[PDB]
């Protein structure tokens, strides 16, 4: 499969999440995603086919993972925006007030601004600390998907937030949305990963 931020993958033939970003760990191909999407050794599929397995994860506390891919996969420095792409360039972290977009298999490509940092989410499994908050909308299945600026600076991966009864927070105003992502930088350093860029 071609590995693009925002696309669907399944975990052990069960849950669905979204790809964060193509990465390498030395010669090993991978993608970053949310930790809550899978346990270590869980099997990832795209397009019906096995693409790799969860190599490592932290959730709760943090919410991060990377999937270790077979060599047959094609890593791409791209995030889905409809049928277009955003080119991944780097991982410069944007400040509160910056515009940012996110990409995922349920709500697609959604944009807003960064509204707060260092937010705790009190999930049923436990707290996850240190999350960045934006007001782009999101919904169930977008987890793990890319957060990126227009200029291609990868920000992080979708964790969670204030899901409404319809499964998303797109039906409430931006001012009421809490859409939380795990910062990319600590994922890259924790696991020794490099972005694939273009």
């Amino acid at each position: 499969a071609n590995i693009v931020g925002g696309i669907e993958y399944s975990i052990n033939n069960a849950s669905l999440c979204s790809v964060g970003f193509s990465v390498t760990r030395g010669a090993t191909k991978g993608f970053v995603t949310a930790g809550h999407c899978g346990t270590v050794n869980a099997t990832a599929r795209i397009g019906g086919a096995v693409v790799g397995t969860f190599a490592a994860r932290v959730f709760p506390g943090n919410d991060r993972a990377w999937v270790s891919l077979t060599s047959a996969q094609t890593l791409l420095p791209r995030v889905a925006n409809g049928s277009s792409f955003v080119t991944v360039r780097g991982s410069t972290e944007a400040a509160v007030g910056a515009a940012v977009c996110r990409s995922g298999r349920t709500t697609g490509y959604q944009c807003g601004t960064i509204t707060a940092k260092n937010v705790t989410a009190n999930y049923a499994e436990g707290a996850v600390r240190g999350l960045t908050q934006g007001n782009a909308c999101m919904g169930r299945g977008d987890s793990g998907g890319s957060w990126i600026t227009s200029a291609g600076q990868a920000q992080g991966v979708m964790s969670g937030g204030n899901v409404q009864s319809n499964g998303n927070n797109c039906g409430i105003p931006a001012s009421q949305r809490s859409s939380l992502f795990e910062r990319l930088q600590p994922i890259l350093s924790q696991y020794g990963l490099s972005l694939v860029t273009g």
Partner: peptide, 4 residues
Amino acid sequence: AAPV
């Protein structure tokens, strides 16, 4: 808040 919920994960996703």
